Amino acid sequence: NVNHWTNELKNCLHFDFPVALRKSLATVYYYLSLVQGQKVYRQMHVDMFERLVSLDDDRTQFTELLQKQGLLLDHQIMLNFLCEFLPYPDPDYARYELSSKEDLQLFRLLLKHAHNAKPFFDKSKESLLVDTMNFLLSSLAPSTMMAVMPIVTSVVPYHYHIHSKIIDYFPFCYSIWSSVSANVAIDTHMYDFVGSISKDVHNKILSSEHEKDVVGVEFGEFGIFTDDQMTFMFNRLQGHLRTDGQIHSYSRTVKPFVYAINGSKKDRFFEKLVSLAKAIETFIHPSNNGFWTKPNAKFVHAFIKSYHGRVKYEEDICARGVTNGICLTSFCHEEIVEIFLNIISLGSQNKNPDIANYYISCFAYLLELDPSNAYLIYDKILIDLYDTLADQFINSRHRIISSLKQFTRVIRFIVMDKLYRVHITNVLSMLVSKLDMNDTNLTSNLINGIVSIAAFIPIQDLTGEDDYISFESDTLPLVQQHFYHIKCGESSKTFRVDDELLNNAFKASTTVFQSMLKVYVEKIFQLVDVDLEDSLVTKINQTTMILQESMDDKIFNYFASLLNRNFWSNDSFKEKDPNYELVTIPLAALVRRNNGLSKELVRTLLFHIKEQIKRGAGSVRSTSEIQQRDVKLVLYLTALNDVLRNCHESLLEYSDELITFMKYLYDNVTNPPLDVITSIVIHSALATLCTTEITDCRLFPEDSKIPEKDRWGGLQFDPRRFDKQHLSFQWHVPSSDEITLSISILESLSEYCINNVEELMKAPRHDSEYGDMIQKYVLVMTHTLSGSSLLFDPDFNKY
Amino acid sequence: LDIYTCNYYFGNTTEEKLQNPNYLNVHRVRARIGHFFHKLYVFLSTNFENNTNMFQILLHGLKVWFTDLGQETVFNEDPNAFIDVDFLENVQSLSHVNEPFTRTNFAIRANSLHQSRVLLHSTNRKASKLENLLLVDIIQLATSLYPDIYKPAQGTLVHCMKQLVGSYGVVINKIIPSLEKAIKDHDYMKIQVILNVLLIKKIHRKLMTDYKDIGRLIFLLIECCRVNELEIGMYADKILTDIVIGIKIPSSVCVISDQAFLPLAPPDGTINLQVEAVKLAKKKKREYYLSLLVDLQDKLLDKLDNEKDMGWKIRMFILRFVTQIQSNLESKP
Amino acid sequence: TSLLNERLQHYTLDYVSDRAQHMKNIYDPSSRWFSRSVRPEFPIEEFLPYKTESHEDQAKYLCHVLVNLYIAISSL
Amino acid sequence: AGYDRHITIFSPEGRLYQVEYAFKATNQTNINSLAVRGKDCTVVISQKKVPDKLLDPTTVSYIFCISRTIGMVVNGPIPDARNAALRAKAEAAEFRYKYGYDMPCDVLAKRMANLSQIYTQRAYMRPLGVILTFVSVDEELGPSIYKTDPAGYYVGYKATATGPKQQEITTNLENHFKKSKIDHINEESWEKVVEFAITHMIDALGTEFSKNDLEVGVATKDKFFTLSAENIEERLVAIAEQD
């Protein structure tokens, strides 16, 4: 059977194999995809091909290596199929008609497959280019428009010869284009073409083989485009954003403009781009929504993806010696920010939050270019943010939520510039305290900030005991001076500070971590009692677990005795139906990091659970609801589940005290909604012994695995971020000792259940506190089978 | 043999495991739990037929015992105490930038790779005598009359055909016989249930491939086109109509550039006679199927020409001989 | 028998029995077993706390796949 | 749009968002109350919290006298408590006039719960953030304790508690009627039933009370009255000289 193997193959790409065998495999799937005559799972075969020819399988490009390794595929087979979609005379036989999904959907696939196998059409059959156009062209007429154009864009190879190049065929595209008015049914193909072709010429010019038979394609002012060709596409794109809204996926529609820039002859182009930003200016304004606000947004993003796209492909090549003056200069990155800054700032305030997240996400792309301008953006974003935390926007909702998104999509970058980074302790301990219990939304957007700051920062006291320290005296005074400066029109380039004072501010800024976590934990227990739900309950647990991993033992060992402390002495689990998750799980993540903390935490959950049972908890029967006199017992039981699951080998110490407590928990305590809970204890302890998992996630290891203490932006940009001595993960591997207790239990609970149930087979049909008990033992049995699931072998029955 | 490898503790298929006391210890225990679940099922269907809460808890104890073998798939995804790989990726990854990750992320990413290497291990197997006994039970339950029971059992028998081999065969050769029964035992709500079964994604799909049994079945769904009393017959028509839209057969020599299989042609001499042998069996397997449909074609035209008047589901036939006396890839007009 | 070993030779899967030089070979363009042009900056399988299967074993399997896939596609 | 969170209509899961929130308001005062039955009395203890030294304790009361016979204690913002008390003080005067007998505890409750229900079903009016605990020694049923809530619900309790540490107090009482296995407190004089109600609250709250931290209401047959500053100190003095 074909389809099966075609899959086990997919499974095999996960390790490696010889390019000489890809030559083979690719050839199989190119010709396989194009079968006719039976039921075929094409989507699969076109996908094998597309993954076998991947152009970025971990920085490796397999289309290059397959070209170089002698792969050549027949174009007549592909074009011959894509042409059955033409008007076959005698209607009685025409098989394919666009319009009707089932058909258009095949066509869209062949076309995709061709695009994939375009580079393996014989560069050497000189008359393959000309022959193929001279055929499609004669086929072009109003009734074919729809099927011909797309073909061209995905079945004709970008060749370039001495006499007949592919850009030879441009003057004909700007004959159709420029004759109909903006029509997405047409344009989309023109942009796809002159763009994936302009991308080509650029790619080819750099590093590799600057040829393909002709470097006889000159770049200049406007990419491969005439003066009038460029001029036209500009007024057409303006037409789209201001008048006729005719574009789809814009990634494609932007290419031509990006790949027509010439680092040494921009000027004349930037002149054209500026006037296109000044036209478009008003239509982005937050109170001019219309049919256009989508196109302008989906474009200003598609364009700044597809520019940063190019840049990070060239900077990968000037890591190969080859500058090329076609390349994008430090001064393009500058004039790009000049252009799209008011534009991006207006869009981000827009009334639609989706149409805003487009303009807001552009800040991250611009900052990666590390332009000289970088300050202009950090300047806005930080004022907008500090204003918001000073309630200066309280009348306007959007500005508050907006300028918290601006700041989040840019936190990681601020942790770097040695000036801004100072603010980051303040801005965090401010977000934490401003976590609202009434505004579900503001809180989701604050956690966003709080978790991002934690994901790229080590919660660490970085003071060498330097006496001047303190947050005031040394950090606050500077932070206010920077802000005063920034607010009065001045920029941060004009801001002069002593490298001595600014490093006092930075180090003294790392003191507040302690006084701020006492305020985060407080805000968590307040949130245990809110009808926030799901999405946001989870995201909050990520922030509590990320905050933990970015913590040195000094601070963490504090955080621990602060969860421990507040978990017991709290007045915070009243309201009906609580989010226990928000507090039990953050405990488990303490025990992951420090198994030693378990020996005593568990024995306290048990002499507090036995306490609640003994005083009538779970005495009163009910399906459907958890009785509120139980809520306490349920806390301690969820904690015991969540915290055993992460106990691991430290559970070997108090093995016998557990099992005998578990048997106690099932002798006493019957109640269908509590039994779905108590029966999980057995799982969270079998899974923890034999499940093979990670254990260490710290931002920086051991407390000491010194990269030094210039260790902020989490090495996220340093190339040492991944040499093996940094990534020294811990891992729990099940030892012969653990598997052995693992099994002791399996048989001891397995028996306990089967006995107590083989007993109740002296049937009381009434009781109903009987069907409660049989359900109990069958749940304990069940969760005894899971977690303990890693010890079983599918194959055992063969042997 | 083994290409997945996940630190199975008892050694990766070395049968370093077979010579391990700790490993016969373990499965001898899952056997008892299996034989005990049957002990309890027979004890309930006998003493407690009119209970839903009991049978649900047992049907989950089987969704587990049948699946949580190599892996852990129920409970698989509950927020637990590990940071989520998908979350962290959003926070840290810029695009057009190779893995700009902090140490924290690299660590879940790796844990996430181990955990996926575990789930890779195909748990698909041969039915274990006792495993066949419990799959027969899970059917008498998806064949039960209480929606509060038959609906989880059906969902539970689907997670069980993902896990057993040609288990669809076991299921049909139990359905049809006990549907033919529930018809000559009259208006049963057991007919209403059996029809609900036949509409399950995984079954309704394997139906258009069962050439043997779809003979007998269409004639049963027809007898069923009489609301002797219920929503039946409305369901029997949706089902017989769903059927006309599947099935067919492909004779036609895959118009293949013979270069679709050559590049992978082994040196092996004529140890590729095998290929021209398969070509021949997958060619009379086919020709038998093609004949089964013609047999069904003519055996219906019988019930249409000879049955003085059946009424307006006179329609199934016509809606079908048509996608047949005009298919090609054979079809003798 | 060794019928296996001559199929590997045609599928260019007869790997150097020693990992040391195989993992050098796999990234060497002028080698017989060129497989990738770029070394993963984050080679995930090494960070696993156990031994992965033999790179030889990977080959023994990918072969049973290729051979059976060949049969499958040529029978129809 | 997402405006089933602002008025008394149905969320997609049959929930009344505005009522659930209304409940959350009853704690906003941070006073706890409990009520008990005697052989022939009824007692309500509430906390009195006077933070501002500028206040006049005598004017600070969450215990309202609704009729000769009927007492009410509210957990909730003062403004809403009075809106309810005034309406009850008048539904019960009207009841006496129209129908000729004093208004009975459980009927007043059904009538305020019915009211509390309309709020729960009409767009334009909001429920009140109060939980009204009604007590009396009704001439037919004996000692009565009936509680209504913003939801429109009412039911009659052996004893009850309401507010922030509600469940700590509630679970103390439950464990003392599991133990005397009855529906009341077998003591004759109300004084000992007041002492008991203060005792089992000190026990449950883990703090002592002074004559200034408590408000006591009491219902005997033919009267409902409240204890003065001193009438309580006497009750406290007696607790302390046996415990």
Side-chain angles (χ1 to χ4, degrees), chain A residues 794-799, chain B residues 126:
Chain A
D795 296 326
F796 178 108
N797 288 314
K798 239 180 173 178
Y799 329 136
Chain B
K126 273 175 201 150

Side-chain angles (χ1 to χ4, degrees), chain B residues 209-216 218-219 249 284-300 320 324:
Chain B
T209 291
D210 196 8
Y211 290 85
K212 341 274 178 175
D213 298 306
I214 209 171
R216 217 212 305 189
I218 300 175
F219 287 117
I249 262 288
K284 109 166 59 285
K285 229 214 237 177
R286 162 169 57 81
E287 284 173 354
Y288 170 62
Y289 295 170
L290 236 157
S291 82
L292 280 188
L293 304 183
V294 182
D295 176 37
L296 205 191
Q297 161 179 107
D298 287 284
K299 275 183 185 172
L300 288 181
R320 96 80 60 96
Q324 198 176 61

